[PDB]
Amino acid sequence: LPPDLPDLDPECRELLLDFANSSAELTGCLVRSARPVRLCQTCYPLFQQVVSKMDNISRSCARSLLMADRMQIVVILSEFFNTTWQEANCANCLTNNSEELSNSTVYFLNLFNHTLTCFEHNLQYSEVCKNCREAYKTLSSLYSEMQKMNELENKAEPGTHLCIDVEDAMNITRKLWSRTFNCSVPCSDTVPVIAVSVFILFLPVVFYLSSFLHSEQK
Amino acid sequence: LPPDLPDLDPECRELLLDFANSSAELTGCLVRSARPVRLCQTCYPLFQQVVSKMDNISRSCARSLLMADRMQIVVILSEFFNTTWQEANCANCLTNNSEELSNSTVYFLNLFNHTLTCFEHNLQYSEVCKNCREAYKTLSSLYSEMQKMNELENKAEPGTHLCIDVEDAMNITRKLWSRTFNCSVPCSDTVPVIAVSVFILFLPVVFYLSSFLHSEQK
Amino acid sequence: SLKYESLDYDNSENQLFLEEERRINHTAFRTVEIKRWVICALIGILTGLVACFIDIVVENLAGLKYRVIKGNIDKFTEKGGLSFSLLLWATLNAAFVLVGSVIVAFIEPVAAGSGIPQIKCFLNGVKIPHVVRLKTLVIKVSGVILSVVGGLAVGKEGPMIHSGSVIAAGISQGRSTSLKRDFKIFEYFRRDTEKRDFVSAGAAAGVSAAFGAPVGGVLFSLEEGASFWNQFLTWRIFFASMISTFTLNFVLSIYHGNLSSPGLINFGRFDSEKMAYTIHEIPVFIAMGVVGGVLGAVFNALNYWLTMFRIRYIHRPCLQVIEAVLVAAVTATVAFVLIYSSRDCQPLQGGSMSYPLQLFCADGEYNSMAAAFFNTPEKSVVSLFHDPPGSYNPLTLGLFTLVYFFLACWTYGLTVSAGVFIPSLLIGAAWGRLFGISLSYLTGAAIWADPGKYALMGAAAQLGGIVRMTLSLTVIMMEATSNVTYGFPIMLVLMTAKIVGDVFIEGLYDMHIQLQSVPFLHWEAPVTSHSLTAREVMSTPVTCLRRREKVGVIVDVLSDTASNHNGFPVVEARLQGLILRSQLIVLLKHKVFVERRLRLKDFRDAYPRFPPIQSIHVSQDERECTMDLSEFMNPSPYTVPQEASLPRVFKLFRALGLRHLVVVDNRNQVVGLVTRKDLARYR
Amino acid sequence: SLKYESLDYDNSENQLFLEEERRINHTAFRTVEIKRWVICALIGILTGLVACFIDIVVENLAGLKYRVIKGNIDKFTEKGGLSFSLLLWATLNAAFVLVGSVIVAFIEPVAAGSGIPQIKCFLNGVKIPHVVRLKTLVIKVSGVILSVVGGLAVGKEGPMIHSGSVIAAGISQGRSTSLKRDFKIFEYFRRDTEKRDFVSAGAAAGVSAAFGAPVGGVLFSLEEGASFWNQFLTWRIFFASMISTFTLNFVLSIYHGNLSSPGLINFGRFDSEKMAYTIHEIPVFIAMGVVGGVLGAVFNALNYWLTMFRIRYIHRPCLQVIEAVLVAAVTATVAFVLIYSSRDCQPLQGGSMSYPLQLFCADGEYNSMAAAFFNTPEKSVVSLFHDPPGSYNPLTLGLFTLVYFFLACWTYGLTVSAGVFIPSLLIGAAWGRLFGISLSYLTGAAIWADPGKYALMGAAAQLGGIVRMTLSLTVIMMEATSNVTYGFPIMLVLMTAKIVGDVFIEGLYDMHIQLQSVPFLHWEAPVTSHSLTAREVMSTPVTCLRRREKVGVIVDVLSDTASNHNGFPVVEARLQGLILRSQLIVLLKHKVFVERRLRLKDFRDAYPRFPPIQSIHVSQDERECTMDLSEFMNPSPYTVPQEASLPRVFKLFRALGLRHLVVVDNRNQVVGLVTRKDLARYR
Numbered sequence A, B: 001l002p003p004d005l006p007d008l009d010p011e012c013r014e015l016l017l018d019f020a021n022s023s024a025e026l027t028g029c030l031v032r033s034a035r036p037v038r039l040c041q042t043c044y045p046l047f048q049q050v051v052s053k054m055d056n057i058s059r060s061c062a063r064s065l066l067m068a069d070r071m072q073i074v075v076i077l078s079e080f081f082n083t084t085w086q087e088a089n090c091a092n093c094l095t096n097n098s099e100e101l102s103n104s105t106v107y108f109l110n111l112f113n114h115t116l117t118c119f120e121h122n123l124q125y126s127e128v129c130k131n132c133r134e135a136y137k138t139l140s141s142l143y144s145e146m147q148k149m150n151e152l153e154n155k156a157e158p159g160t161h162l163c164i165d166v167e168d169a170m171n172i173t174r175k176l177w178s179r180t181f182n183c184s185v186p187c188s189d190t191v192p193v194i195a196v197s198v199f200i201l202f203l204p205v206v207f208y209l210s211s212f213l214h215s216e217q218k
Numbered sequence C, D: 001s002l003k004y005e006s007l008d009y010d011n012s013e014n015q016l017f018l019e020e021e022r023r024i025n026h027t028a029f030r031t032v033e034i035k036r037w038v039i040c041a042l043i044g045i046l047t048g049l050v051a052c053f054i055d056i057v058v059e060n061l062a063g064l065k066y067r068v069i070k071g072n073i074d075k076f077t078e079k080g081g082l083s084f085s086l087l088l089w090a091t092l093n094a095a096f097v098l099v100g101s102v103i104v105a106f107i108e109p110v111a112a113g114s115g116i117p118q119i120k121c122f123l124n125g126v127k128i129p130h131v132v133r134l135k136t137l138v139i140k141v142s143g144v145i146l147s148v149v150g151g152l153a154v155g156k157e158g159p160m161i162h163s164g165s166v167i168a169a170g171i172s173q174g175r176s177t178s179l180k181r182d183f184k185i186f187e188y189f190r191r192d193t194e195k196r197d198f199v200s201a202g203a204a205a206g207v208s209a210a211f212g213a214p215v216g217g218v219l220f221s222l223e224e225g226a227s228f229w230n231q232f233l234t235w236r237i238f239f240a241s242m243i244s245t246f247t248l249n250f251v252l253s254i255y256h257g258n259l260s261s262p263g264l265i266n267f268g269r270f271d272s273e274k275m276a277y278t279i280h281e282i283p284v285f286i287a288m289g290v291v292g293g294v295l296g297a298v299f300n301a302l303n304y305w306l307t308m309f310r311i312r313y314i315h316r317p318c319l320q321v322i323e324a325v326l327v328a329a330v331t332a333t334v335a336f337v338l339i340y341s342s343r344d345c346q347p348l349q350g351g352s353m354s355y356p357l358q359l360f361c362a363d364g365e366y367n368s369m370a371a372a373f374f375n376t377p378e379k380s381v382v383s384l385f386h387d388p389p390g391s392y393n394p395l396t397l398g399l400f401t402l403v404y405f406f407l408a409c410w411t412y413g414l415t416v417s418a419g420v421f422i423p424s425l426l427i428g429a430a431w432g433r434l435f436g437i438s439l440s441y442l443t444g445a446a447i448w449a450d451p452g453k454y455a456l457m458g459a460a461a462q463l464g465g466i467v468r469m470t471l472s473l474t475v476i477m478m479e480a481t482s483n484v485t486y487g488f489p490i491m492l493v494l495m496t497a498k499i500v501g502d503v504f505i506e507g508l509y510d511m512h513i514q515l516q517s518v519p520f521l522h523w524e525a526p527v528t529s530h531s532l533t534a535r536e537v538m539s540t541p542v543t544c545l546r547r548r549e550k551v552g553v554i555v556d557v558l559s560d561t562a563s564n565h566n567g568f569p570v571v572e573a574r575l576q577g578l579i580l581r582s583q584l585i586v587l588l589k590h591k592v593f594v595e596r597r598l599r600l601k602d603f604r605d606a607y608p609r610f611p612p613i614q615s616i617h618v619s620q621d622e623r624e625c626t627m628d629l630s631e632f633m634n635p636s637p638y639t640v641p642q643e644a645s646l647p648r649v650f651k652l653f654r655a656l657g658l659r660h661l662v663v664v665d666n667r668n669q670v671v672g673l674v675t676r677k678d679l680a681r682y683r
């Protein structure tokens, strides 16, 4: 029979096997590296390898492997990987070279490590708050600065997300601060606000009553 | 620190690892078993195991693994698997018990094997056609019968697809028959069709001319 | 031309009408408005049910016919003898079309055509003899069913309009004249004004059911009426149209099982990035409209040359039946030949075609020509609008466009219920998609060159070119497309397509109205209108009835066989009012002479059919008595100065829906009368 | 009430007009229609550009204000002293509102309000003194900008209507009276009829730009005009509206960079399975409309009690400025207090709010009350329509609904440019979503109980209840929603909401029109209309001008300080025509006496402002000369019989847009005259 219809050509066999191996590794790593979220710094090499292998396929065996079925399992798998990558903004962590993480995200994660070091240090909750205030505030300031830097660099719309690992760390810290330890102590200014609002609300009543009485007097 | 925020609880670790292993196996099998298409009969056990493991998770560790991130890698992976399964109609191959394939699809694939046996037998193309006509016709009749049976059993809309493996085999056979060997020999009835059409097209002209001449005569 | 009477929309404010209104308003409760709203609701509901019935029957019958033909073709593909399939197709088409043409040509010739020109004339104020009869409704429904199932290049959308009108004209009266069964409701609305109002509501409901375009139907009715603005009537028409759409959708949904069927034809959803136009596309659209106009004109032109022939050789009913049968057979033969000679085989997505036909094509493939001819026109149009860029072969599409254009031109004038909206839309969509493919080839596969958008534009352009509507058509297309933006291109292509068309020939509906010698009043008087005045328009001398007239003179004037005038101005020679022939006949039949008292109910009971003059018997002695007319005439007839300009007179006549306009001198002297025929004899 | 004159829509077909038309048609080419189309295109383009300018300026200024306030609040959150933020908010609001109220109250008081009542009166035929002036346009644009940026519960959508009208009234004349600059084009259209036509086109364009609803604007203009159907005028209005929408969308798109902005407010896309209604939901919709009506009535009622107070105590301009400033300050204070007392913190999706405010909320969370008050009303409405089931807290939504209801009731009558559409829509959406949440709780989280659909229904119900429009409002909501199906519920809720409202109180626009003592003609005469006749309506004795009248008598009658009549019927005592005061003044100014020849261009040059009687100087000898009036009057005035029924007279007067109607006897005897004030003094 013709080589292509009944069974696979010898060369395309290797490409399919390699893509299968890479996809399996990437999927396992994603599942294992999602709690706490480590998708970026752990899975970036595997994702790069998967993309490289699919490009290798696309650049003779493209026809016999990609689009000769109602489905295209290769295509849908790669597109799912790409959707997960894009919907993470994980390129934020990586530089233009894709080789290693940017110093910004390393710095943030390392401040996160130092912060949790402070938290555990003083756990054994006034102690923890009093001593880790500065660490938490530096962490939050850096998160805001990176948010603004990403927004201006990508010229993206406001509220655009960052690396999921950074956001997950930010949220873990926020939950530890606001709730488990409840260190937040916003100031209260009830009396000035109440007085000012009451006076301003009184003003229109005085205006209308004065108009009424003055018109009555004529 | 609290067990859940910074790091994973000991129990959820096992669930995440098991799901990762199953997902990796399933993805590798899908990539390897897609050319020629073998997704159903090869991957059904792995898909069943993945579904079972995710149900195991969902039924304490659901909270800490599923929906405590902007993403839910577990959820999106399982939903991608389910989309691939549903968009295959692969339940057609499997019985209600999900254990093994139905006798219908086994019978079809086995007729496909017998058919390709006939094709290779007579390859060494009039020989192949003359001897495998009956095999190909039985295969096509069975495919049509299964199409109708699926349509009436599922009460689905016309043209609904079947197991991707069955369709891929059907198409491989169709390509071998119609093109590589070009065995199809539809009959020609040019003369009767032409004569009938010409006469029927003449009729209106006669009608109008007769009306004209008769009215002129008065 | 003189058998076409007029509609008495101008209600006469006589003493009896004033007394009736006073009594009605003195009942402590008014029910007329509630009854009007109820009637509109019933009109919409029944129109929707009729549309549902038509759709269901067409679906089932056409499905069976196509299944039989496809089975025969597949059975004979390899064994041979494909001619027998052609014979079977032609025979089935001929049988169905034979039944339809027999029921129409012999029993009710009025049911022929779409029925839209008839309703246009009705809302203009002209009564065609058998437009709103029950027999006409039954015949039209059966004929549209048979013609659609008969394989003709026709549509089942336009006729709905007519159908709705009939219903509105029927249930409003509260009785069945044809069946001679009377129910004791809705006696008040037994008059021409309410009848016309309800008919406008019904036509709007029919348009909405056909296209899912309530506002479009409202605008259609408003344009055809072209009257003084009425807020409550417009509200009622809107209500009826929307109830019609809701009823159609709900009933179809419940029939199918599980709110996605606003109308009979549904173009689909155009909300996509592919369907989007730039400013640079404004010129091309216009250019394409030009083509429409041109093509449309040619279409109409040819039909004219056809119609004359039919009027003057093929006028006997049996000849009409033979012509319809032969047209159906030739349509089937042409479709079969085009499918047979096709060589383009395409893979089948699965469910893309209800009945995929494989003929000299590799297994697992279908023939596109079959898709074009072996399918319903509506979903063919829908596919033409929604398909990927490379879903069509230019040669097959061009052949289909040409052949269907000629077939639809041939088929419009046949003595069968049919329509011309969908065929025109299909022709336009086909050549518009051809234009889009050409542009994509020329523009290097540019993103903005989407063939479906250009197909929609071509459909709109062709529809406008053939039937030249701009506003209501634009709104209908906007609602069906469900996108407001695409209106701006549409309005342009419809604007130019119309203009170019008017250079060469008039529209189809207008042309057929004139060929029937119907007096049709347009929106405005001609260019020379300002030059003319009412003195030449009015007819003299005028036959006037004295406020104190004898029975003998009235009988003599009424019985005059020279002419039959249904309105006479009263005179003292000072105008005092106007009385219609019908009122005089009713008065004579009741022997109301001066030498126990009448009510308007007696006038309404004689509606809508009044006895002739010859029927009334008056003795010699009675003829010597006098008739006191003062208390039965219109005391405030509409009048214009003898020197009033023609455009002013035409404007007043059209806006107020008048039948008789008295032209008077400076001393309230009757010097002339004006009717629609005086105004319509200009161009 | 007597300072409100009327619009001369009834063109006088005098000899000079006939000669002008003859010459124009004898030029071998007609350009009037082309010029009309060009004018409509410019009207649409300029209205779109004005809308774009307003949107851009509002966006930038409001963004800066909100950013400053948010930065101050965040800076003082933990350090303390949050009162200073309240002071800053109030001060900014007060400054902007102060500038707006100063420009409106002192320079141009006519610019106050939405301007929709003024245009309604204009299309009805009543001229309010300074409605279509350039100063009014500039003041209205600046005031709407300042009020929207001033933090008031107002909208920038209604005023666009007014703006469009001005443009149509300005560029049509071809000259600038205010700037005293004349360009030599469009002399033909210097008349009331063309002015009203163009103004209707401009109002339709404004509606389309505001809501992206061209057909809705066309219907609005048609309803307000309520005249004889005109096909070409309706085509032109449709053209102008669609050009306006296209211009707005295109300019906004190019400004933003990369066809998704049909109007200023855009409700969004409702094409979803969540947005779908069953038959069982028809009753609840109606019930909800009831509430609307009730609530609407209360709203209007309170405003009435407010307006009277303002008319009779707060009428000095400085008091108006103080009131506006205080209202702005109180609005800011109430918003700040509600935000401060809020305890519901919600996670932020990212970009859900342009300026998310965190105040006594955990890090990474926002305050919903800030979202309600610290955001634009338009996108607040959009969010209310499109949010998940559990996106709101019932208590916060109820508080916001109540407070905003009272604030919007307070703010409508202020001496600042503003609007009442968007606030009513927002109130309706809020309490409709509250109803939807209640239903979902009651129905066990049923799928059909989607709060967004009920929010849309409540918005429609409240809008109808406050401003009681049914047809054009229904079409506007359908186009904005971009779904035709949801019309059927809408039409119902608008139908009942209106009806219930009419039981208690009239609408806002109508109420304000009456409070100005403007003579407003409704669609139909009252219930007792049939009883009355033209004899009581007409005013006697009539001042008539002989066809051969002396200059002295004409001067004496014109100069009579007892009353100022601008129309006199001519008499021989047989009616021969009608001549307006303006024509007599022009004739006297030119010394046209019999004891070189005039053209209509001289009449048009005096437009629109004519000199008074006192200005003309006539010597004693000249007064002894006679004036040949025959060749300058309306030779064919509209006339009705002395006994014609009142509804007939009112119908003719409203449809034809007449100013003077002669009531004549049986011998063409002048016995009375009828003007709009005679008809409007009924209820």
Ligand SMILES: CCCCCCCCC(=O)OC[C@H](COP(=O)(O)O[C@@H]1[C@H](O)[C@H](OP(=O)(O)O)[C@@H](O)[C@H](O)[C@H]1O)OC(=O)CCCCCCCC
Pocket (backbone or CB within 6 Å): C042, C046, C047, C049, C050, C053, C129, C130, C131, C132, C133, C134, C135, C137, C166, C167, C168, C169, C170, C171, C172, C173, C174, C175, C176, C177, C178, C179, C183, C608, C609
């Ligand atoms: C799903 C199917 C629903 C379809 C509804 C079909 C019913 C509509 C219809 O097809 O017609 C009804 C007939 C009247 O038609 P009809 O045959 O008597 O025709 C005369 C005659 O033909 C004159 O002929 P003319 O032109 O010579 O004067 C013409 O003018 C004049 O208008 C006509 O009344 O029965 C009824 O009223 C029904 C009873 C109404 C009371 C109940 C109200 C609740 C609905």
Ligand SMILES: CCCCCCCCC(=O)OC[C@H](COP(=O)(O)O[C@@H]1[C@H](O)[C@H](OP(=O)(O)O)[C@@H](O)[C@H](O)[C@H]1O)OC(=O)CCCCCCCC
Pocket (backbone or CB within 6 Å): D042, D046, D047, D049, D050, D053, D129, D130, D131, D132, D133, D134, D135, D137, D166, D167, D168, D169, D170, D171, D172, D173, D174, D175, D176, D177, D178, D179, D183, D608, D609
């Ligand atoms: C993006 C901004 C675009 C906005 C366009 C604004 C222009 C529209 C406008 O705001 O107005 C234009 C003014 C006329 O306004 P105007 O101040 O002179 O007002 C008198 C007066 O106020 C009477 O007052 P009255 O009520 O006492 O009689 C009143 O009736 C009468 O209608 C009015 O003409 O200039 C023009 O025409 C422009 C030249 C047109 C020629 C070019 C055509 C191509 C476009």
Ligand SMILES: Nc1ncnc2c1ncn2[C@@H]1O[C@H](COP(=O)(O)OP(=O)(O)OP(=O)(O)O)[C@@H](O)[C@H]1O
Pocket (backbone or CB within 6 Å): C002, C004, C005, C006, C538, C539, C540, C541, C542, C543, C544, C563, C564, C565, C566, C567, C568, C569, C659, C660, C673, C674, C675, C676, C677, C678
């Ligand atoms: N009372 C009348 N006296 C003299 N001429 C008349 C009178 N009524 C009508 N005519 C003229 O006679 C011609 C035919 O009139 P016809 O008898 O068709 O009137 P009609 O049937 O009442 O018109 P319609 O039914 O279209 O309103 C018309 O051209 C008309 O101008």
Ligand SMILES: Nc1ncnc2c1ncn2[C@@H]1O[C@H](COP(=O)(O)OP(=O)(O)OP(=O)(O)O)[C@@H](O)[C@H]1O
Pocket (backbone or CB within 6 Å): D002, D004, D005, D006, D538, D539, D540, D541, D542, D543, D544, D563, D564, D565, D566, D567, D568, D569, D659, D660, D673, D674, D675, D676, D677, D678
């Ligand atoms: N020529 C006339 N002779 C006698 N009464 C008149 C005449 N014209 C108007 N009136 C009456 O005088 C009253 C005031 O009329 P007015 O001077 O406002 O007319 P007008 O200003 O021309 O009306 P409008 O401008 O609203 O058309 C009205 O009630 C009207 O009926």
Ligand SMILES: *[C@@H]1O[C@H](CO)[C@@H](O[C@@H]2O[C@H](CO)[C@@H](O)[C@H](O)[C@H]2NC(C)=O)[C@H](O)[C@H]1NC(C)=O
Pocket (backbone or CB within 6 Å): A100, A101, A102, A103, A104
């Ligand atoms: C992040 O930024 C710092 C700048 O402070 C980079 O620092 C240099 O790093 C390179 C190695 O890539 C050294 O050779 C240089 O000596 C460092 N200092 C200077 C002044 O260049 C740092 O490399 C950046 N991080 C990454 C990953 O590139």
Ligand SMILES: *[C@@H]1O[C@H](CO)[C@@H](O[C@@H]2O[C@H](CO)[C@@H](O)[C@H](O)[C@H]2NC(C)=O)[C@H](O)[C@H]1NC(C)=O
Pocket (backbone or CB within 6 Å): B100, B101, B102, B103, B104
């Ligand atoms: C497919 O259908 C055949 C019927 O012809 C089934 O045949 C029986 O199979 C069972 C085993 O499951 C045997 O024990 C029986 O002896 C067989 N014959 C009869 C008459 O029952 C066959 O099992 C079916 N295939 C599957 C996978 O169930």
Ligand SMILES: *[C@@H]1O[C@H](CO)[C@@H](O)[C@H](O)[C@H]1NC(C)=O
Pocket (backbone or CB within 6 Å): A014, A052, A056
């Ligand atoms: C792609 O596959 C071929 C086949 O062995 C191999 O030679 C080549 O190096 C591959 N490319 C990359 C980038 O790995």
Ligand SMILES: *[C@@H]1O[C@H](CO)[C@@H](O)[C@H](O)[C@H]1NC(C)=O
Pocket (backbone or CB within 6 Å): B014, B052, B056
């Ligand atoms: C789910 O996981 C638990 C954890 O070990 C295990 O005991 C249980 O058997 C699992 N369930 C299934 C169906 O494998």
Ligand SMILES: [Cl-]
Pocket (backbone or CB within 6 Å): C112, C113, C114, C115, C116, C117, C118, C512
């Ligand atoms: Cl027809």
Ligand SMILES: [Cl-]
Pocket (backbone or CB within 6 Å): C154, C155, C156, C157, C158, C159, C418, C419, C420, C421, C422, C423
């Ligand atoms: Cl049709």
Ligand SMILES: [Cl-]
Pocket (backbone or CB within 6 Å): C114, C116, C158, C159, C418, C419, C420, C421
């Ligand atoms: Cl039609």
Ligand SMILES: [Cl-]
Pocket (backbone or CB within 6 Å): D112, D113, D114, D115, D116, D117, D118, D512
């Ligand atoms: Cl206002």
Ligand SMILES: [Cl-]
Pocket (backbone or CB within 6 Å): D154, D155, D156, D157, D158, D159, D418, D419, D420, D421, D422, D423
């Ligand atoms: Cl507003």
Ligand SMILES: [Cl-]
Pocket (backbone or CB within 6 Å): D114, D116, D158, D159, D418, D419, D420, D421
């Ligand atoms: Cl408003």
Ligand SMILES: [Mg+2]
Pocket (backbone or CB within 6 Å): C002, C004, C005, C006, C564, C566
């Ligand atoms: Mg007649």
Ligand SMILES: [Mg+2]
Pocket (backbone or CB within 6 Å): D002, D004, D005, D006, D564, D566
């Ligand atoms: Mg006046």
